[PDB]
Structure formats: C-alpha cells, structure tokens
Design an enzyme around this catalytic site. Structure first.
Site, PDB file in Angstrom:
ATOM      1  N   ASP B  25       0.820  -1.204   0.000  1.00  0.00           N
ATOM      2  CA  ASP B  25       0.000   0.000   0.000  1.00  0.00           C
ATOM      3  C   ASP B  25       0.860   1.263   0.000  1.00  0.00           C
ATOM      4  O   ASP B  25       1.318   1.716   1.057  1.00  0.00           O
ATOM      5  CB  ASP B  25      -0.922  -0.070   1.221  1.00  0.00           C
ATOM      6  CG  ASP B  25      -1.909   1.062   1.287  1.00  0.00           C
ATOM      7  OD1 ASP B  25      -1.799   2.021   0.497  1.00  0.00           O
ATOM      8  OD2 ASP B  25      -2.812   0.991   2.151  1.00  0.00           O
ATOM      9  N   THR B  26       1.076   1.824  -1.189  1.00  0.00           N
ATOM     10  CA  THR B  26       1.888   3.047  -1.340  1.00  0.00           C
ATOM     11  C   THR B  26       1.239   4.294  -0.725  1.00  0.00           C
ATOM     12  O   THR B  26       1.923   5.284  -0.466  1.00  0.00           O
ATOM     13  CB  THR B  26       2.243   3.343  -2.811  1.00  0.00           C
ATOM     14  OG1 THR B  26       1.045   3.497  -3.600  1.00  0.00           O
ATOM     15  CG2 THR B  26       3.113   2.238  -3.406  1.00  0.00           C
ATOM     16  N   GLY B  27      -0.071   4.240  -0.513  1.00  0.00           N
ATOM     17  CA  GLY B  27      -0.793   5.336   0.170  1.00  0.00           C
ATOM     18  C   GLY B  27      -0.709   5.319   1.690  1.00  0.00           C
ATOM     19  O   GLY B  27      -1.191   6.248   2.352  1.00  0.00           O
TER      20      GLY B  27
END
EC number: 3.4.23.16
Lengths: 6, 99, 99
Positions: B25-27
């Site tokens: 999850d890059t967010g």
C-alpha cells in the site's frame, strides 16, 4: 493510511 | 518482481512466526496488521484515513519477511480491515512505482 | 518516471482545467477526490477505509491527467483526507510496483 476498498 | 495493478497487490509475509497475507500500500505511511501479539513494549497511536481514525498499538524494531525480502521497522497492530504494508517497509525492500 | 517511497508519492493531476495534488495509492481500488464539482450525473457508492465506511459520489468517464498521462474513468468525490489515485486509473497510466 489510505487503503480503500469498494 | 514486477506487480501489475489489475488486482489488489496482495503478497505473503512472515511475521512473529506467522504467515499472513498483506496488501502493498503506497498510500500508507505505516504498516498496519490485524490483531496479534508481538514481542517487546508498545505504545498507543491513532491513525487515520478514509472513514476516520482507529487506535492501534505501536511496536518498534519488528522483523518481517515480504516475498522473502527481510525488512525491519515499526509495525502497528489493531482493527484494520486488511493487513497493510506501508511505505516504512516498502522502502526497505526497494519497492518503487514505475510508469 | 520511477517514484521511490521515502516520501509520500504525491504528484500533480489536472481535472476540469485545475491542478491538484494527489497520492498514488496502490492500496486503493478506486480514485477518490476531495469535495469539488464535476459534470454530469452521479450515483451513490459506499467505500471502506482504515476508519470505516463513507458515502461518496460516483462520476463515470471523467477526464483526468496524472503526471502528464491522460486517463478517462470513474472518479469518486467525498470526504477523503487527501486526493487519491487508485488502481482504476493507475492501470490506465501503465503504473506497476517493482522490487
């Protein structure tokens, strides 16, 4: 923590 | 590996013995896992996103294996709907976004 | 471009002729933008995040440019903490995760 699901 | 984004980027991780499924999850600033016990002392923290905030327990210096890449860092534990690997560990395995 | 994850993956997008900042978010199925006005009709959608579920407005076939790459697809509007570019548009720009 911006995981998001339909 | 190269991971396309047609589906959720779910991978197998290994932590505290246990094998788990987790979303890359890059967010996410932080790594957040469903309720479990981890070794060492912890402190409470509030984390937010879509839907508001949840209270989690913060553990530091936790070892994790992500697709066989070892990574150490802070892991938060609490009532997350899904196991999330956030940037704090994604950087350690050399994960990048490319287009 | 290749984007590392030491900082939040914030990029410039353009929608309705206006520049905004948005997070490239592999943990998001959908693209969710802060309150704004878009053309045409909307329909209801419920989405889940770290803190629970929220109601958002779904607009389809919306033109949006992301780091100069053109996309046309579904954009959700609602009380997100930050503009987020989800997998529905990340796939359109050819974005992958690599390590």
């Amino acid at each position: 923590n911006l995981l998001q699901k339909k | 590996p190269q991971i396309t984004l047609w589906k959720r980027p779910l991978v197998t991780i290994k932590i505290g013995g246990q094998l788990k499924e987790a979303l890359l999850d890059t967010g996410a600033d932080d790594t957040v896992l469903e309720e479990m016990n981890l070794p060492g002392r912890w402190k409470p923290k509030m984390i937010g996103g879509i839907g508001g905030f949840i209270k989690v327990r913060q553990y530091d210096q936790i070892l994790i294996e992500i697709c066989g890449h070892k990574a150490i860092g802070t892991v938060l534990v609490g009532p997350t709907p899904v196991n999330i690997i956030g940037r704090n560990l994604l950087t350690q395995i050399g994960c990048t976004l490319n287009f």
